[PDB]
Amino acid sequence: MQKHWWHKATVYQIYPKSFMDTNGDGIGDLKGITSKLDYLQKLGVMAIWLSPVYDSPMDDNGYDIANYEAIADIFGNMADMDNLLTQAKMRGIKIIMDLVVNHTSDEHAWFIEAREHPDSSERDYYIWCDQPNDLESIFGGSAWQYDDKSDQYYLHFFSKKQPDLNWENANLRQKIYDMMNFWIDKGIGGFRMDVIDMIGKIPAQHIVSNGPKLHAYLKEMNAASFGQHDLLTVGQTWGATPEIAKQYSNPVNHELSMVFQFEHIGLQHKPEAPKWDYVKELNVPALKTIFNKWQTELELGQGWNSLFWNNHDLPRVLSIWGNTGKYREKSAKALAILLHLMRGTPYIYQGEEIGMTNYPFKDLNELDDIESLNYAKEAFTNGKSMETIMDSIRMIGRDNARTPMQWDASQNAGFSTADKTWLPVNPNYKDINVQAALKNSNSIFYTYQQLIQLRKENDWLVDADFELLPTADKVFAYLRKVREERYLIVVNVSDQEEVLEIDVDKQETLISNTNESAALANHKLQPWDAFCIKIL
């Protein structure tokens, strides 16, 4: 397998509204990010996945873009973006921009012209229909919005203010590529592609994800933009299987570097049940099956895995799968160790490295996310009390991932000087903040730092295979093997003491959140015990 820079990289996701505010409007901005670049360099990440900072009415907080080549006023201006690029560059960090091209804002020039002049070219940049089908929006209701003026429905798989782009239109695709090249020329490190597996959609045939033209489109995109360069491209692919992932990430296909798959995320809810009907306890054997499948199927020189627990769309991993009480730190370290020592590119969401958690939202009025609010509006009329709804949202709502980054124990956790922040700061900031984590030599932060440096400095994290070991249900254990080198990873994914009936010759300890020697000797694991040891 040909090696690229990003094979040694760890990616850090920044949610711009919630990272750092430098002008007291209670909203994060570019200058804040740039101001915290040294912190990010100390962590050791090689790239920043920056969630959208483009011009946007913020109805889906950036993922409804009105101008792909302008910065939203709330984040600053283009000068701030350039400065972010240059400073990050100076600190050895690349910027990965969020590419959102399945849809635009309804306030994009293209759609405004599409409505103004129905005979214009950009009218066909979108998907118009006289006779709509039963396709639903992801945010509830019909995926077809009737337009009084032109008397046609336009397609939107998300919000009504996010009309879908017509990817059957080659001119539209071309303008997308022009824009992508605009950003490539500015010196970005790559693209994260929002719901990219949807661009092959054929709504008339009820085809949404994994459409027949999808990979042709991705090949065309590659050829027309980032292909010649040496960038990291990661696609968000809800409907991805390991085979489809092979199609995406095998370099000979000339498409993407890797994709985000969500099979493990599916364990956060019951099969075929809405995500709001959340699962209470992590099914560790199920996770074993899923992770093992993705590790073994995506062989080397055949595809590349992405590794993540959580993002701006998901609950923080501690709240849904970890421990938020007595074993918060230890469980956080355990999950970090478990994920990062597999093969692939790991992604750290902001605050994950200090063990931030979900927020205890009290009512709908505190919420911002359109998905949660729409869900609430529908659920309240279909037999669910507001408290039930708020419970589900408290566990699964996207706003849980979007509370302000917790930097210290000062006002608003040092995120802002404003009286109020756009989302409330979690009260646990007095115990859970960056300053305290940096001060604590054995904090979650330094576990993440160690993992990152391990990946940066050791080829076996890339080269070695994966073998799942037969263990107790809640014990996640595997071997990474390369040449004669054997690396054992053991993680007790539970609040309970578990048995460890293996006998090995420990050569050395690479990382551990506990007494690995005592665990091996007594053949038992304390709750959330996690270590990696090189064995004979």
Ligand SMILES: [Ca+2]
């Ligand atoms: Ca601000």
Ligand SMILES: [Ca+2]
């Ligand atoms: Ca009319």
Ligand SMILES: [Ca+2]
């Ligand atoms: Ca103030």
Ligand SMILES: [Ca+2]
């Ligand atoms: Ca210290």
